[model samples]
Target: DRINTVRGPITISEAGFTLMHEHICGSSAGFLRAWPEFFGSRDALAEKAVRGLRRARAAGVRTIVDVSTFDLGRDVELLAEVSEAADVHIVAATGLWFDPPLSMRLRSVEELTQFFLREIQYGIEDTGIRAGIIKVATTGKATPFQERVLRAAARASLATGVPVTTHTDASQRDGEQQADIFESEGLDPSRVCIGHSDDTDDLDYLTALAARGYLIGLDGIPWSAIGLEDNASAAALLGLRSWQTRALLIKALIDQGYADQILVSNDWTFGFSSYVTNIMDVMDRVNPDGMAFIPLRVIPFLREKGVPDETLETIMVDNPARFLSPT
Candidate 1:
């Protein structure tokens, strides 16, 4: 089976050692146009992403699934540039993130479905780059707007057979609601990934979702535990910073025979704009590893804890190949 990469389509076998979720660069839609100084040129954005992605490549990552939507400042051209520069397959997305703009909310679900379908079937913004996955998000409860977006995403996946990935505020266990919408739309549970499943250490919540045949993305792996001790706010944002318990959670899921359903990533971003001052510094302090976190840190940790190579390969390579394949 084949999947679309930013550069073009490749067999799923080529999607080796994949990171299932990450962002190249993102901002509020026009932030770059409005503040070109703070947000550098397109080349600069591509350079930053290329550097991080190259490091991931060096660490044995062959593909990265970029989950940024256009409203989140996804630049498909830049994605192409970074993919070639970093020598890694970049899979782009076609769906909305958590926040739907007024323009988006004004559209009927049918209109939104066509929007996603155009990107999947035709191309994105005349770039002729098909998206490989459908990305959608919900913070907690699904508002009518969010529900509409989810329905559109489900419809698009049903239309195209592309897999769906999502952002969930795991503290609220919102993935359940995302699953509900997909199920109600008659979307196959296997085609939807309940993302950010690592945000909470609630084993019951994670396993319950996995038990329902839904792929789960433990994609919020942190770079370090350095700043989490005294920073209550950052701790809240990252959960308890329990890498040990998180490792155990992974082991538990595998032991329970949900290995095929597990997808792991750092959910790191190369560049993300924020109005808050020193946001980059704060993010660096909280997450220094960026895209290489898993290959450099998490995998070694799991290996030392006796996780087998075949299991790691399954999670990193085979599962991504299976999930993204339009089989």
Candidate 2:
């Protein structure tokens, strides 16, 4: 079975202790073009990225799936440099994220499918650093435009045996609708992950999605900069401030014997926002020790919830191995 990283293809067994979803730098292609000052310049962002990753490495993170797609300005070349510096394997993604330009949104499914296949086979543009996953994002409801892109992602995954991951609006329950499309398109439900699932505390909703054999992305463990209106909604849905509640959600599914179907990560990033928060500000930033949000903070929290280290291993190491494994 094959798994691709910025360093190029590697065996699935080598993908250990992975952060299932994250973005070292994430932005739309247009955003980067229009605003060069966005994330404090590429060099500055890369420096910040190296800092976070070295910390992650010290804490024992071996692999990270950077789910930033081209539409989201996923720079594989930069990813290569950053991964090499941090001494970690970074698997980049291929597939479009949400809100394409009006013209692109008008393109056919076949075109999108072909473009994704090209990246998987050749390389993204001129960068020889190939993508490891096909990523798609859908917000609110699955728009017809989104349906087209998503179907393309499924076809590409089926054709190449590459796995597909998604950024979902978990509150709207779009992940379920997404699963229906992927499953009906002949993908094994297990081949797809319904991400951003931690944004909700809906156990029944989350459990139903998990029961279908798909990996559930508790991928938002470290909160990103949520939109203003979403702030109230996010707080109310989980209705808890501390990270413990998120860990508790993990435990509920684990005890139900679904430990094998869970994937945990922070969805941390350094780009795309109109107003970016500096991670170094420990007082306000949800800082790494009060965080790492996974390895540093959540692990102890999980163990306290009676979620055995074995179960944690299944989520941390085993599940991702299976998800990233070739068809």
Candidate 3:
């Protein structure tokens, strides 16, 4: 029996489909720069957030893993309030963002380990803000900073028994580095998700990570910041042949017994006005013509291509639920 310290020990509803990653209400560094005046007050932010959650409920989204970390304006109280109001399970995280200014200044592995451990425990113990998973990010080149964060997250997972997830840069090395650190930490690689791998066209890299038991995140499909616009468009423009090739890569990975480790999400946001704008920007890049469901268009496209309902459920719901559940 898994117990969510934040929501308590309980059974998730059939509506309890899990959103692997998303931003409900917060100002990321990029978001804040674009919308400096947004969320100036708690009341203002909370009102806007509740509206978004209501929309999510209408969309049939039941649980959301809010990966917004520290320095990203992750308001636990606001998450709690929104969860209560919307009748959705909002699981928050406690970790560092990749953006340097937003991350804690910990250079050594030990220091980094301490920082993450303390925050994870504090979030669980003090505010009842149970961290569903550990979060970390890398610049994609496996820099010292990336290594430290991965090691820290791995340590936190070892100490707290929580799964780990990471934000990888466009370069894609973060996933490899994460696998190394988690393996070194003796943690189950399946419990780690390499986020933003959608930005890379390197199937070999993705395959290698999946081979090591790490979950691959194709969630950033709609968020183009990580160099996906050109890649995805190029594949699409190359006609159905090229598109099928790309799809085959995804299918091959799953067919090779890695399906259970794949997870997908919109990585979408609603309340952060600029986040919505950013989504629009990506949609415009993907489909210059009139395509209203641009952000959520992948699921249907995949379905059209023979992706079964249960497989889709595994990626969109089952895997995430199991990932966030206590092992």
Candidate 4:
């Protein structure tokens, strides 16, 4: 049996499906610190995570990418337990999140590059915790921090041969910034994914990024109670048809000869549940049953949407497998 170096004595990945972006464990920073009352304590968080993963496994999810980066309570130890108990292959990541404190520490491009190299090399080499991919994020602007992080990630990919995935804020310019950095660093654009592209509706922007051979990650599907806008909103507001909008942005990449460079994943965090509750409470003030955020329902809804068995398999299974598979 091929042993998992991080978590000992087990077999996983035999099952078929993979959820690209999920937090099987909780993140320690941000919501937990800013709103302790809502996030609660670590022990409670861990218990909730265990339950969530168990439920996910029962629902037939086999592999999960826990994109919880460093200093964010990655909890590889807890991940090991979840993987073993739930019979799922849990992949962790090592990089930096684009929050204020973390970005402040990365002042220079070289400093950020060194951080990436260390994480990519030693994170797996020393700790036995293999990162399936590198994670980096950018605020709405392509600020100095975003450029530095992208440069560092590209360098790390060149050195370690692992792919890089990003967390882009609502402003879509970060994708262009990522492409520029990777191209300049001589990294294969195919090895990079500009995540959260659903935040923007500019097909021209997406097409430009795709032209450079980078994958587009559109993960956030919308529901009412969450107050989350679906990609279709931007398209509709722009007077574009839903299928036409998706095709122009997503399928156009394929038609333009960049099919293999596309991927999709949900950026759903554990705290979204609270976000949903808050929205629902406000709705209730206006009218009863006004605010209802039923999150876990998305999976079933997507399954029922005639997303096509093969297409769903590709998005949730083969695409991520290809992304994580060693080059």
Candidate 5:
């Protein structure tokens, strides 16, 4: 079976040690379009991703599937440069982000499905960088429009044999709602993954989804989210870091023989500057461990908690290949 990467398709055997969910940069679509100065220079952005990714490669990460959809300012050309510079395989995506403009959200299922199909079957914007996966998402609630995106994504996956990955509102515990839409579209349950599963500690809900044979993306792995506020501990304010709540949840799933259904990543994006945006300060953040989070911190942490090496291998390597392989 074939698996597509930024460098092109390869046998599933070559998919090796993949990070199933990540992004080089994720800005809203119209943000850059509205202000051309917003993107600045992509070369700098590519190089920003290049350094960490290259280091990640040496740590045994061979591939990364960038799941940023269109409304998230996906730039394949920039991604291509990053992949080449970093010497890592990058699987680009075809789909929509959580919030599309009203015009986009109002489109018919046929129209949306065709767009995804075009990118999957051909290439994104004629750049010849064909997407390897479909990214579908929803915010706080699974609105009617979000379901529409899920159905269209399912249709494209069914048409092209590509798998669909998702971003769900874990706080609301609505991963099941995403699954329901895909199942309604008759998507093979195996061809879908529910991302941000790490955000929830409800093993019952997670295990139920895994039992349905859907892969779960423990994307945040050892942390809560990205940014300085999440990491830094100031004199007045202690670091608002999230505990290893999800790490334990994932470990439990693995101990129960659900290791093959698990995937992990930092979901870290590169090239964001704190210069203008108020979103979060990246400049003040210190990456003390860097890309070593998964291989070093996470593994040792898991082992301390008694997660086996074999299961780790399943989560880190085998599971990704199995999920990314063409149907």
Candidate 6:
């Protein structure tokens, strides 16, 4: 099946090793436009993105599904440029972030679904670069508005044959709630990924989702640069700060025969505006490897723990293709 990329469409086999969740740049779309300097100018932003993506390519990542939506400054033009320069495919998203524009509050779920449908079928804006997937998110409990967004994403996915991936507060087990909504909408669970799942060490939660045919995204692999004491607390809540814990979890999932339902990623971004207070530097300092962390570090760690190379290949390569491929 052909998948949409920033450059255009290609067969799912052409996607190669894919990172299911990542961002090239972030911040309010307005902020990114008003002062691109916050992210070291548009040129530098693109350069940093290209450099990181090239590193991922070197580590064998041939495709990246950029989960950044409109609010996160999803710039298709820049995505196209970086895809060409880095020689990696980029599948951009069409949906909303945790908080959509206030105008969305006035729109019904049908209206929201139409918006996503337009992007998937008609292409985003005038660039004619259609989004390859639908991205919707939930923070904690699903607010009335967040539920509406989720419904819209489900409808759009059903209508267009594009898969849906999500941002979730794994600490709250938000995927469970998200699945309930998608299920009620008659969307197949396999068409959606429960993202940010690595933030919690709850195997029961993850396995339950996988049992229902949903892909589990252990995508939050990198910790923030938020200082020691607070960082530890955050890590503790998220079940991070120890690679061993996540590694073991991966093994367990595979052992339980959920390998095809597992996907891992750095959840990294190339740049973000000052709204995050030095995010660019923090991500650089803490996750210097960026996209390569999973392939370079995590995979080796898994192999050491006795996960076979075939499993790694399936999780890293085959799983993403199957998830991204329309059913």
What's the C-alpha lDDT at position 325 in model 5?
81
Which ranges of candidate 3 are over 4 A from the true structure? 3-9, 12-15, 26-37, 100-103, 124-126, 224-252, 271-296
**Which candidate has the top score in lDDT?**
6
Q: Give the winner by TM-score: 2 or 5.
A: 2
lDDT for every model? 0.83, 0.79, 0.64, 0.58, 0.77, 0.85
lDDT of candidate 2 over 107-219, digit per residue (tens): 89999888889988888888877787899989978889899888999999999888889888887998888998998788887889888888788888888988899888887
* Model 6: per-residue Cα lDDT over 25-114, one tens digit each: 876656667888777798999999999999999999999999888877788999999999999999999998875778776779999999
lDDT of 3 by residue, 280-311 (tens): 33444543321112124555677777777788
| lDDT of predicted model 6 | 0.85
lDDT (0-100) at residue 223 of candidate 3? Answer: 41
Counting clashing residue pairs in each candidate, in order, gives 0, 0, 0, 1, 0, 0
Q: Please list the residue runs of candidate 6 whose C-alpha ends up more than 4 Å from where it truly belongs after superposition.
A: 224-227, 230-240
Put down candidate 4 lDDT per residue, 193-226, tens digits, no spaces.
7886756667677778877777787644331223
Cα displacement (Å) at residue 149, model 3: 2.1
TM-scores, all candidates, are 0.94, 0.90, 0.77, 0.72, 0.89, 0.95
Q: Please estimate how well model 4 matches the true structure, expressed as its whole-model Cα lDDT.
A: 0.58
Model 6 lDDT-worst window of ten: 232-241
The number of the candidate with the highest TM-score is: 6
Give candidate 3's root-mean-square deviation (CA, Å): 5.5
List the lowest-lDDT window of 10 residues for candidate 1. 274-283
TM-score of 6: 0.95
Please identify model 1 stretches exceeding 4 Å from their true place.
223-236
Per-residue lDDT of 121 in model 4: 58
Report the lDDT of model 2 for residue 1. 70
RMSD of 5: 3.6
RMSD of each: 1.9, 3.2, 5.5, 6.4, 3.6, 2.1
Which ranking of candidates, highest TM-score first? 6, 1, 2, 5, 3, 4
